[PDB]
Amino acid sequence: GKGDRRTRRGKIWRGTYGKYRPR
């Protein structure tokens, strides 16, 4: 998962946000 941008765990990895990790 950690490489998969379209997931929660994925955007935590990058340190960014979106629909798949909201702030």
Partner RNA sequence: GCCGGGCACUCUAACGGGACUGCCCGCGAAAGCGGGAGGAAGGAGGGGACGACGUCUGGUCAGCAUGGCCCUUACGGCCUGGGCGACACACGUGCUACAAUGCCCACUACAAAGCGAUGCCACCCGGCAACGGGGAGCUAAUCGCAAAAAGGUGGGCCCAGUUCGGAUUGGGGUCUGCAACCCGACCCCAUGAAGCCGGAAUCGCUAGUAAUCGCGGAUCAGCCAUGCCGCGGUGAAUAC
Q: Which residues bind Mg ion (CB under 5 A)?
A: 4
CB of 22 to Mg ion, least distance (A): 18
How does 2-20 read in b/e, with b if 16+ C-beta sit within 10 Å? eeeeeeeebbeeeeeeeee
Residue with tokens 């979106």: 18
Binding stretches for RNA (CB under 7 A)? 1-20, 22-23
Binding-site partner at residue 6 among RNA, Mg ion, none, CB < 5 to 8 Å by type: RNA
Query: Which residues lie across from 21 on neighbouring strands?
Result: 18
Binding-site partner at residue 12 among RNA, Mg ion, none, CB < 5 to 8 Å by type: RNA
